[PDB]
Symmetry: D2
Subunit: 298 residues, 4 copies
Amino acid sequence: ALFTGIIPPVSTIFTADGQLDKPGTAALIDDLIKAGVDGLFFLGSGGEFSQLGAEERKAIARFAIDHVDRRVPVLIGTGGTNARETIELSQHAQQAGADGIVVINPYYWKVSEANLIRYFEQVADSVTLPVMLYNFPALTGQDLTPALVKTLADSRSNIIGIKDTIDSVAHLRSMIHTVKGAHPHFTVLCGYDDHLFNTLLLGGDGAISASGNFAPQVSVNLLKAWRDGDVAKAAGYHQTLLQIPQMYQLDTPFVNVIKEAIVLCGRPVSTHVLPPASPLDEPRKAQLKTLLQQLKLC
Amino acid sequence: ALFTGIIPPVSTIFTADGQLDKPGTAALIDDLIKAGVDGLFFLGSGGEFSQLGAEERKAIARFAIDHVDRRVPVLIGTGGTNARETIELSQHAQQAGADGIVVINPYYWKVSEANLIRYFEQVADSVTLPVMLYNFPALTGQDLTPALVKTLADSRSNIIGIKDTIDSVAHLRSMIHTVKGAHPHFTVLCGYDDHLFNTLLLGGDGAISASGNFAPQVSVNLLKAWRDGDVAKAAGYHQTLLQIPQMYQLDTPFVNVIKEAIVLCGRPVSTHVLPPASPLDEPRKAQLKTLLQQLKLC
Amino acid sequence: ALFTGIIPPVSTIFTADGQLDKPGTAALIDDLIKAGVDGLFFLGSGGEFSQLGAEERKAIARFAIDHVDRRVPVLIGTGGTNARETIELSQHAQQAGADGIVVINPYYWKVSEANLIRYFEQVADSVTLPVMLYNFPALTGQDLTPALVKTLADSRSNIIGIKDTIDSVAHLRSMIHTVKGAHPHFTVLCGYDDHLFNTLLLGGDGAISASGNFAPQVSVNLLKAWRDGDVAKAAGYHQTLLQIPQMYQLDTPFVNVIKEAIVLCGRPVSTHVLPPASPLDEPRKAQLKTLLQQLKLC
Amino acid sequence: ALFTGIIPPVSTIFTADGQLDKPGTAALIDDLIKAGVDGLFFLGSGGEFSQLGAEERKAIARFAIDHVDRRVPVLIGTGGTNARETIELSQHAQQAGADGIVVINPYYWKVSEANLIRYFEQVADSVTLPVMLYNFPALTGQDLTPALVKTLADSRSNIIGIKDTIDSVAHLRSMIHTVKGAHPHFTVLCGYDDHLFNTLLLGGDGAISASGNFAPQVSVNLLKAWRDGDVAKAAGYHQTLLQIPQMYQLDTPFVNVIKEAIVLCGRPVSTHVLPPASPLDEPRKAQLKTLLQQLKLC
């Protein structure tokens, strides 16, 4: 089973003028590796893939891959609405040395089932890398049903997992029974902090969630505790991850909040975000702070 | 805090010709009390309130209350679309000796906010009993937001809790922070088996869920374990409750399944259900059986 | 083809204490017949069926049927969530002399497809009367798709039409092609004033909409104009019906508004509505008035 | 009032290997101008903006602008999820000679209200051109409410219209009353063929809809007829436009269908579409043909 455990959707650090902040993004990568994470995912939602042009995303990927220098597995999010561009980026990711790619369903047009399967097949064929699906129906408006995901895993041997970003036990439970039921080593990771625990108890494999950027220890320790068979300990951490998602209510998009948390949790980096996102106002920065303090994360 | 802990939405047992099966419903009540539950809720969704006429519901309530004979707290679900009828039933519930009522939002028309608050106020005034709200947006098509529920608790001192039937951690978390944040002894119970654990760890109060009818021990034991500070034990039970809701996908409505489970789990009762529900076919009864067996509940 | 043309969802007039206002409801019936309508539909949504008990609805139906005295066709809305009650009422409607019944899909539980078809079959079998389906997904949360409605018309020869209450040309167009395509004399009526014109030009059959109660001439004249081949005239009326639905935005439910419009348009009747609805405040009554004046309806 | 009347969302013609087919897209432009249209909109949804990269979209826009050579007004759709790119393209559109731009709301993240207003303000400021908003909630998952659109027109004097792509009379009616009520010369165009008629009768201004590409005469004639005060004639055309949208059910996306219709209606052009779209199979091409024949469009 590939890409299990705690794999954060790493934040892309930018300068005040909007360029890649290499010292800062590198500093962030290094903290996260040091924290005991099982991989890293660049250019996910929290990486702000949807606010970057093709060429920019190529540049961020190659830098990120290079800086990681194979210390842990690296995933590159290559998705979007432009299928041809999805292939360019996915191929480039392979060339550039990535360990796999993460591909969301086209989210402008909700594409026919036939078209959707053909899309995913085509991208999976364009590379020899592992392909990790990415479901996020709240944003895509088209759910990758467990039936469909089983169909896709049956169809291509390199479609080997999924990040299920949804506040639903049923969806995660069904994803596990239907897909892992047919393919035991298919990876199922959840997209939200507050589902990591349940996702494990259901016989899933881990999480790619925002709290990896600023409190990676909680998820890493939850996982170690669970693998060590100490469940009470794991639940202890779950309890923190249960509360964490309050913060994300402070703005939309909440990439600003994640980056601001990174700072408050001890890593001084530029919190500049790309439009249509905006800086977090002062009042809500202090609210974030009080929240992080209550939870004992700074 | 009133009506905390494990309070099953008791199934109403019917004969083959559709009348109240008194021996059978009494037998069921007695098992559940014996199992260590903290209350009982008659004429909820699983009680089939929406398939019974006013007079029938009066009759079921009076029987149920009488048979319980004050051994545990009794809640009567008095809701529907006909507000005047909601008052008749709620008042009748009081005079019949019930400990409180459970009121869902009117689910045909999605009523204006002003009208909705006025409805709940009016019913809460028509009785001196505790009033427990009931949210089930999947069916009602109108969510009782934590804001609105805070407003209602602020408004009437006898609106003292809620059954939140939704597959969402966020909703339960927000319900707790917003409402309990303002009213510490406001009860918040979850409507689904797989959320009991999280609902506790969030500082909520228990569950009214279907698995109470056929596997009440699991939820009762989870709750005692948690109260005894043995979390690993509690999680052990959570793990079973996590799987249980597969059963409910076998039909819709799945009130047939719950009753069939009651039988398979050792309590022989008539599984007749009211239309537009129907008996569970043989194939799916056996599937239920294999599921209960896998989970070690029969 | 049965039940074509302009068939208003007649408002049920109540006294202050909530009883049937017979003088007033009779007065209303008489205006509407005198206006040239092609039938009348009692105990629809605007009739407030969902706020009345079984016995009350029986009483209103017989009174209404009797007072019409066969001058036009009469439809009785017998739907709800309680299937057995749907049969009692539907049978009672036949015994009481009604020309057909109108049956919405059960709107609490969104019932399985198999269950839904079996429900509609069962009620259609419980009577020898014509059965008119009623779709209103905005409130029911379960759409009667054209596929499903074709299935139902194929299944039972007395399922002979539908009131499609939805703000969608596509749905009405599809309902006509799929169902009328297979059953030419199947009736398709729209539920909203602003769709009557399109519904005709699509090869549908008429409307059961609220503006029948207070401005029945507009829809009656639109229909006559269209049948006389004078389309420009028909479009003239369409233009008024296009604007009428602004009022319904003054409250929810907006039965209060319809009844208040009946008064302002010249028919003094009690505007009492059943809870959880409430009287329309004074400011909004005056806004209604200005609207009716602008459109030249009072 | 700017950009009124019939302004087709022109199809971008591509070669087999996916490049701009200049002879073909020029041929198409010329037919449409010849047909009497009041403008042209390049790089809308039907132009496939969401499957083209920034540089490609630049290239298509200038070519299109140049080939039109000011014969009619030209609109360029510059929207997407990448705000900085939206400014690049919008500014490029101005320098390339476009008469205005068309900007959809960011459709990946459903952005906060504050952020959404700030986005639209920022883009409107980046140019001196007229800005035409674009609502399409079915795809975006975030509706541009009439309230919000009024706010935006109040905020910036160059936000001067909207393409409302929604199958809803209520939404269009409300958009007209709320926005035109405050700004009489604000343009309101509908996005669907079957709403053009109603949109006019409501006091709106026209349509940007797919049938402009292959049957522009129908909409052009409807508009001329209506302006000439001959309503019966206009309704005659409405009747065809009412049926047209059946085809769009043959695939999703249905850009393939539009382009195939262009061919069958007399203009031989390459029907190549960009992925994740695909060619229309033979069976469904013949079905399209039968449809166009029934409606007397080929």
